[PDB]
A paper describes a structure:
Sobemoviruses encode serine-like 3C proteases (Pro) that participate in the processing and maturation of other virus-encoded proteins. Here, we solved a full Pro–VPg 3D structure of ryegrass mottle virus (RGMoV) that demonstrates the structural changes in three different conformations due to VPg interaction with Pro.
The VPg sequence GEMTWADMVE, corresponding to residues 256–265 in Δ117Pro-E/A-VPg, forms a short α-helix that binds to the surface of Δ117Pro. W260 is a key residue in this interaction; it is located in a very tight and largely hydrophobic pocket, forming a hydrogen bond with the main-chain carbonyl oxygen of D77. VPg-binding sites are mostly hydrophobic, as they are formed by L51, M55, M76, W80, I82, L87, I94, and V96. The VPg helix is somewhat amphipathic, having W260 and V264 side chains located towards the VPg site, and T259, D262, and E265 side chains exposed to the outside environment, so the VPg–Pro interaction is also strengthened by hydrophobic interactions. The binding of VPg causes several significant conformational shifts in the Δ117Pro structure.
Residue numbers in the entry: 5 to 176, 183 to 195, 256 to 265
């Protein structure tokens, strides 16, 4: 798996880091289209960490040249998901202002196929990301086996095939076939001002 460093702001527009309060990246996620709006998607065990410590959505802003973060409000409503170890995926209806403050654009979900080439992203900070190359194959139920190298911290990160997301990385590699769950589907802004 070719692991490369990614330049600040050069990751996919849909990618977010999920961080503890000291900045530690403890998972990843993405903004995806779901019917007439969009949702955050990530691994269910990443958001379960929110009972251990506060979680922050984080993304690097090119226009500001800095990191941005928003606390994950625990009242955001789920769209779908399952904490079953074979699914371990959760989607959250995140307000528009959150996504706007972070500058996150939405990706489309696509079915994976046998040996589809994929990229996974993670890293230790929002402007210090890496990519790993690999292949992905569906298992015919809910998962996808893949060969992208990942670290702890990369749970919830999408497997991108081209522009689209075909899976959500789970753990040591297995990912969730997201198409299965997606079937159901002047100077300062006020969002920046309120935090």
């Amino acid at each position: 798996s070719i692991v490369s460093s990614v330049a600040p702001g050069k990751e996919p527009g849909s990618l977010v880091c999920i961080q503890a309060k000291d900045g530690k990246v403890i998972g990843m996620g993405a903004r995806v289209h779901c019917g007439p709006a969009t949702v955050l998607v990530t691994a269910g065990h990443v958001l379960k960490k929110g009972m251990i410590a506060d979680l922050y959505l984080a993304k690097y802003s090119v226009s500001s040249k800095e990191g941005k973060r928003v606390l994950m409000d625990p009242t955001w409503k789920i769209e779908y998901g399952s904490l079953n170890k074979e699914a371990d995926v959760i989607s959250v209806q995140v307000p528009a202002a959150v996504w706007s403050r972070l500058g996150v654009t939405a990706a489309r979900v696509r079915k994976p196929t046998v040996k589809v080439p994929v990229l996974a992203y993670g890293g230790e900070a929002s402007g210090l990301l890496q990519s790993s190359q690999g292949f992905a194959t569906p298992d015919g139920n809910m998962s996808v086996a893949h060969s992208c190298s990942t670290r702890p911290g990369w749970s919830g990160t999408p497997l991108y095939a081209g522009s689209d997301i075909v899976a959500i990385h789970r753990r040591w590699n297995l990912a969730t076939n997201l198409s299965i769950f997606h079937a159901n589907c002047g100077e300062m802004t006020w969002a920046d001002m309120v935090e």
